Ligand binder design. Structure first.
Ligand code: 99L
Length: 127
């Protein structure tokens, strides 16, 4: 059993910006999801050795989690809000790919995804 390297959270050659929408994705969107009762399985990269999921990284090839997103946001990693939203979408999609409808973890992702969409339905205006 071997975990892969987790996704990067810094990259000096990547272009980045500090926009009002990205600030909101950290202060409001991420920090609200983070406190939800169903958030904890999503707060760090899947540790497939700890969790005894040896097929996880056989199936999931673009891993993503809210801990990585949080550090990317805190480290000014993104150029725009769409990039960050894409990471959220990847996290949710990975969960549906690796699992099945009805699994507890899937019920958890579905709840978070609906909350996520509710929060990004309206974003602040790129001042
Ligand atoms: C979101 C990333 N991710 C998966 O894709 C996934 C698949 C099966 C279990 C599991 C666990 S768990 O064992 O801690 N637990 C979580 C709560 C519900 C339980 O059924 C299982 C934590 C995080 C996970 C998984």
């Amino acid at each position: 059993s071997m975990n892969p390297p987790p996704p990067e959270t810094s990259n000096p050659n990547k272009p980045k910006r500090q926009t009002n929408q990205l600030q909101y994705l950290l202060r409001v969107v991420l920090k609200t999801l983070w406190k939800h009762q169903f958030a904890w399985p999503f707060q760090q990269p899947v540790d497939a050795v700890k969790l005894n999921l040896p097929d996880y990284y056989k199936i999931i090839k673009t891993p993503m989690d809210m801990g990585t997103i949080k550090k990317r946001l805190e480290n000014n990693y993104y150029w725009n809000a769409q990039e960050c939203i894409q990471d959220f979408n990847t996290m949710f999609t990975n969960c549906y790919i690796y699992n099945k409808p009805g699994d507890d973890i899937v019920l958890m992702a579905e709840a978070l995804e609906k909350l996520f969409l509710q929060k990004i339905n309206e974003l602040p205006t790129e001042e």
